[PDB]
């Protein structure tokens, strides 16, 4: 319902800044049964590298596909795949979510797994 | 004397009466009187004409006035030196351009309607000509 209306309003404040500064975006998305992440090229061209909880390489071993430990799995995978393509100097996009639980666990796990912001 | 009941402003630039006006065609009534020459109409004249048709046509028909006088026009006081600010507003003017229909009627015979506009038009300040509705 009306919180897809609300979320997009929160997002656009930050998100316009990062594309206007010309910086590569680690964008996250949350859903209660799936957690999603993408590193997008600064100008909206190619999505450089992504991880979700609906790819098998993440999905098979994890207790739930929409909890903080499942978020840590997505952050852990995604950073190293970005470094393998040579991507670092990325900035975080919290996409109308609070920087709180699954998202916080993921963003810390993404820097710790390797990503240099 | 008609006048707007309230306006945004009280005094107004002289302007030009340059063009040719939108109400070229009769369209409520069957036939009407159009301005041919351009000019200004002083609200009193619009009144004097409405009365004239009412004296002519009587208790038949409906009279429609399309022009409405609404540009205030100023006059300096009698016997005053020039240029101590802009004059006081005196009377209200409709700016009529060629082809503007002034008055329409219906609910009345054609021969009576030709006569009714002769009386009214003699009181107006521009040359004027009887206009009929038409299909397209």
């Amino acid at each position: 319902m009306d919180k897809k209306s609300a979320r997009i309003r929160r997002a656009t404040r930050a998100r316009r800044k990062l594309q206007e500064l010309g910086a590569t975006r680690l964008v996250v998305h949350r859903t209660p049964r799936h957690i999603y992440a993408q590193v997008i090229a600064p100008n909206g061209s190619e999505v450089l590298v992504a991880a979700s909880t609906v790819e098998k390489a993440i999905a098979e071993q994890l207790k739930y596909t929409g909890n903080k430990d499942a978020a840590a799995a997505v952050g852990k995978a995604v950073a190293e795949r970005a470094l393998e393509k040579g991507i670092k100097d990325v900035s975080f996009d919290r996409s109308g979510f609070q920087y709180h639980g699954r998202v916080q666990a993921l963003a810390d796990a993404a820097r710790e797994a390797g990503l240099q912001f | 004397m008609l006048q707007p009941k309230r306006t945004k402003f009280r005094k107004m630039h002289k302007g030009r009466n340059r063009g040719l006006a939108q109400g070229t065609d009769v369209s409520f009534g069957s036939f009407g009187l159009k301005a041919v020459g351009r000019g200004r109409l002083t609200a009193r004249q619009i009144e004097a004409a409405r009365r004239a048709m009412t004296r002519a046509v009587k208790r038949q028909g409906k009279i429609w006035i399309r022009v409405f006088p609404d540009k205030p026009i100023t006059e300096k006081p009698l016997a005053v030196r020039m240029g101590k600010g802009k004059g006081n507003v005196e009377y209200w003017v409709a700016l009529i351009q060629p082809g503007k229909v002034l008055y329409e009627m219906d609910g009345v015979p054609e021969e009576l309607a030709r006569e009714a506009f002769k009386l009214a038009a003699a009181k107006l300040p521009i040359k004027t000509t009887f206009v009929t509705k038409t299909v397209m």
Partner: protein, 84 residues
């Protein structure tokens, strides 16, 4: 005689300050670029013409030529420069 029609509420006159100098197709680093003050709406800012002072002077932010665009939802006009 010399009869009098009196003073007025008058006008206090204006001022002069309103905008005084947009620039075009230049090359300077931080030219005023569009000093259309009193807005950020008449013009908006993007690319290396992310200027936008605290009067809405849309100064160039690096060397270039001003393109001018009309961009996105709500159809705002945007100043951006092509780098020279």
């Amino acid at each position: 005689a010399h009869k009098k029609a009196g003073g007025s509420t008058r006008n206090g006159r204006d001022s002069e300050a309103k905008r005084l100098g947009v620039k075009r197709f230049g090359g300077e680093s931080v030219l005023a670029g569009s000093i259309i003050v009193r807005q950020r709406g008449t013009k908006f800012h993007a690319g290396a013409n992310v200027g936008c002072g605290r009067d809405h002077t849309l100064f160039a932010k690096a060397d270039g030529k001003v393109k001018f665009e009309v961009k996105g939802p709500k159809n705002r006009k945007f100043i951006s420069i092509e780098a020279e």
